[PDB]
Paper text:
Here, we present the crystal structure of mouse IP-10 at 2.5 Å resolution, which shows a novel oligomeric association. The final model contains four molecules in the asymmetric unit: A (residues 1–68), B (residues 1–67), C (residues 4–68) and D (residues 4–67). In each molecule, the N-terminal extended loop is stabilized by two disulfide bonds between conserved cysteines (9:36 and 11:53). In each of the two dimers, the β1 strands from each monomer associate to form a six-stranded β-sheet with two antiparallel α-helices lying on one face of the β-sheet. The dimers (A–D and B–C) are primarily stabilized by reciprocal interactions between opposing β1 strands. The main-chain hydrogen bonding at the interface is limited to reciprocal interactions between residues Leu27 and Ile29 (thus accounting for four hydrogen bonds) owing to the presence of Pro31, which disrupts the β-structure. In addition to the A–D and B–C dimers, another dimer is formed between molecules A and B in the mouse IP-10 structure. This results in a distinct tetrameric assembly that is formed by the association of two pseudosymmetrical dimers: A–D and B–C. The tetramer has an elongated structure with approximate dimensions of 90 × 40 Å2. Intermolecular contacts in the tetramer are through molecules A and B. The two molecules associate through their N-terminal loops in an antiparallel fashion such that their α-helices lie on one face of the β-strands, while the interacting N-terminal loops are on the back of the strands. The rotation axis parallel to the β-sheets and dissecting the A–B dimer relates chains A and B with a rotation angle of 179.1°, as calculated by LSQMAN. This is a novel association in which the tetramer consists of two six-stranded antiparallel β-sheets, with an antiparallel sheet formed by the N-­terminal regions between the two six-stranded β-­sheets and all four helices lying on one face of the β-sheet. The solvent-accessible area at the interface in the dimer is reduced by 1770 Å2, which is higher than the buried surface area of the pseudosymmetrical dimers A–D and B–C (1280 and 1170 Å2, respectively).
Interferon-γ-inducible protein (IP-10; CXCL10; 10 kDa) belongs to the CXC family of chemokines and is secreted by a variety of cell types. The biological activities of IP-10 are exerted by interactions with the G-protein-coupled receptor CXCR3 expressed on Th1 lymphocytes. IP-10 acts as an immunoinflammatory mediator in Th1-type inflammatory diseases, rheumatoid arthritis, cardiac allograft rejection, multiple sclerosis, atherosclerosis, sarcoidosis and prostate cancer. Oligomerization has been demonstrated to be an essential requirement for the biological function of IP-10.
Numbering used by the authors:
A (entry chain B): 1 to 67
B (entry chain A): 1 to 68
C (entry chain D): 4 to 67
D (entry chain C): 4 to 68
The structure:
């Protein structure tokens, strides 16, 4: 809880409306790094392979992730 | 996202947890800027000075917001 | 007794550009200030001012 | 006829630290690949390799606390 930290991440906007394994093609998890002090979760929906950034801090998201 | 863009924002982690307007001492809304290309919404919970970053794209949040 | 201890002593009405604001604060009604308050930090000079919650330039603006 | 298309040819059972992982691309069990595939891209050389979905170095690495 300081000021603005300059960061470099893939995800800028984080999609909210959840889903389930059924619709998700691939799930890409990216561990926290020096450039992006947070985990990034990018799902590719079989629906036109629409890529969506999810919130790793979200309960549902956590549930879906770990199996 | 065509790639990674260098960005400078107040919010790094978005508490996509729940809430509503009991408590919430204050709610800050920072329009999208050249430095952060998406609006930030910082809530200062009535209790304990604790600050939470809310997802501006969250239906609940857009509705909690469009309620002033 | 009619009493009030709010942050705003002055309420702006002069319409303001969506892009001229740097920050916006919404402090909801309380016993100490039964009225909602919206304080904007303008980009220019970073001057803080209060906008009318009831105003359209605001209701429209509130589609942030 | 018939056909089967999994991405993995080798399954790295050897341990691995979250430290050296760039990312995981977890692919859900499909009709074409009747199991889940977890491809890791090591930080080192950006090397890709498959890890066993049912291995501990993975389950504990499956971070969420």
């Amino acid at each position: 809880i300081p000021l603005a930290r300059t960061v470099r991440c893939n995800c800028i906007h984080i999609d909210d409306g959840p889903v389930r394994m059924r619709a998700i093609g691939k799930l890409e998890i990216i561990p926290a790094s020096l450039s992006c002090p947070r985990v990034e979760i990018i799902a590719t929906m079989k629906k036109n392979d629409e890529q969506r950034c999810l919130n790793p801090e979200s309960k549902t998201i956590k549930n879906l992730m770990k199996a």
